[PDB]
Design an enzyme around this catalytic site. Sequence first.
Site, PDB file in Angstrom:
ATOM      1  N   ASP A 252       0.835  -1.194   0.000  1.00 26.72           N
ATOM      2  CA  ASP A 252       0.000   0.000   0.000  1.00 26.72           C
ATOM      3  C   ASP A 252       0.871   1.245   0.000  1.00 26.72           C
ATOM      4  OD1 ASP A 252      -2.806   1.319   0.581  1.00 26.72           O
ATOM      5  OD2 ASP A 252      -1.376   2.257   1.958  1.00 26.72           O
TER       6      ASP A 252
ATOM      7  N   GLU B 205       0.852   5.715   0.133  1.00 25.79           N
ATOM      8  CA  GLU B 205       0.167   6.991   0.276  1.00 25.79           C
ATOM      9  C   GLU B 205       0.856   7.973  -0.648  1.00 25.79           C
ATOM     10  OE1 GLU B 205      -1.991   4.888   2.830  1.00 25.79           O
ATOM     11  OE2 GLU B 205      -2.492   6.718   1.719  1.00 25.79           O
TER      12      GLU B 205
ATOM     13  N   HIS C  56      -6.745   4.341   5.961  1.00 25.74           N
ATOM     14  CA  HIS C  56      -6.042   5.328   5.146  1.00 25.74           C
ATOM     15  C   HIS C  56      -4.661   5.681   5.688  1.00 25.74           C
ATOM     16  CE1 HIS C  56      -9.602   5.504   2.747  1.00 25.74           C
ATOM     17  NE2 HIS C  56     -10.331   6.005   3.725  1.00 25.74           N
TER      18      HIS C  56
ATOM     19  N   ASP D  56      -3.720  -0.069   6.418  1.00 24.78           N
ATOM     20  CA  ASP D  56      -4.366  -0.522   5.191  1.00 24.78           C
ATOM     21  C   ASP D  56      -3.674  -1.753   4.624  1.00 24.78           C
ATOM     22  OD1 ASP D  56      -6.207   1.466   5.460  1.00 24.78           O
ATOM     23  OD2 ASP D  56      -5.458   2.695   3.809  1.00 24.78           O
TER      24      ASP D  56
HETATM   25 MG   LIG Z   1      -4.288   4.228   2.351  1.00 24.79          MG
HETATM   26 MG   LIG Z   2      -4.490   2.144  -0.956  1.00 27.26          MG
END
Ligand SMILES: [Mg+2]
Ligand SMILES: [Mg+2]
Lengths: 201, 202
Positions: A15, A17, A173, A178
């Site tokens: 994941d 950001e 988030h 996540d």
């Molecule tokens: Mg995220």
């Molecule tokens: Mg994501």
Amino acid sequence: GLCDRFRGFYPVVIDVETAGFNAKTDALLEIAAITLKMDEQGWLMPDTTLHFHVEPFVGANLQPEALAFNGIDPNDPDRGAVSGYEALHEIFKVVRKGIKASGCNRAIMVAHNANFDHSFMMAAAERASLKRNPFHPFATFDTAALAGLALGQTVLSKACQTAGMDFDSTQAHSALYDTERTAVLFCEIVNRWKRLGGWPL
Amino acid sequence: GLCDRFRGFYPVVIDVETAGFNAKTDALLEIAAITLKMDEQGWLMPDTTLHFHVEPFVGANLQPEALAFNGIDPNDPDRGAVSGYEALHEIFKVVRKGIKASGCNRAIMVAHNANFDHSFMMAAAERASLKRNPFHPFATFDTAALAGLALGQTVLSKACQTAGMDFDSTQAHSALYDTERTAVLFCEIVNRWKRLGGWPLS
Ligand SMILES: [Mg+2]
Ligand SMILES: [Mg+2]
Ligand SMILES: [Co+2]
Ligand SMILES: [Co+2]
Ligand SMILES: [Mg+2]
Ligand SMILES: [Mg+2]
């Protein structure tokens, strides 16, 4: 063993950001990675966890809406942010190890709406001129599609809840959280398939 | 309950042929679309098929290696190619119909290594300045991932053979044939999950 399951692919949950939706122009701000393992019983579970805060690359664009969304202050002095090169290099090091040890020949990214994280990872690797990328250059394991099939849900929070997992929107988030939920979700979909006698063939 | 199955998503199988791997600069050459339906017993099968030969957009790049691969001769006036606008608009009309006819909210692309076909469709839509796109702007149902889970295979030909389907490499790499096999593959994965008692959830 993990590598007989996916024709040699070593699945790694990822994941990111970001400071926007554009992989080529928007800052990568954070990345977490979770490798997986298969037990003696043939069940899937999380293995190793890596996490890095990433410094916006030189010239990177930053959309306030994204920052408003992920809550990341790219100017916080003690983020402990590293270069995109540093994050990927450290992650790639772990991935390569886990690959040879299990008999796999290549890593595949597991991610939710995977095209997104894959595009950002590939863009970051490009920026840094990294020549040794253990991840498949275009194939992914998208958990949104997988949950669509398994759970009739495509939204991460909804998919996890439907899968019986706990999910905490106030932790949502964040890269680490996540990734961990996505990893647990992916293992559950795979384990459930085996459970119901879908695997082995 | 086709749109009960995928939280309102109307799955449409798409395959494209192109003059390269770059969705922004390489020509779209062919596109085929297969909509799906669910019978009264809850089983999934192909519904409607559309297929268009597409004229390389003005300024489009053409990679010989791509043309070598898909056997497409962008110069044969017999090809009967249409503009990208024409192909998508015709496909969108059929898709838009199917959505509001089954209680659906949006379309979602089913494709093999779906990020590829989705990128090319979105690029074509943007070049033509199409404003009403029934397909979800970023979510897809990638059959490679789905076959990885269901069949332990990610290669289309291999996934199909493993699924018990016939597959003919001499017909492969043609938009129509690939889309049909991909549609059958997707339906079988969904139907097999149901057969095994994976669906419904209760
Ligand atoms: Mg995220
Ligand atoms: Mg994501
Ligand atoms: Co970077
Ligand atoms: Co076009
Ligand atoms: Mg294809
Ligand atoms: Mg093809």
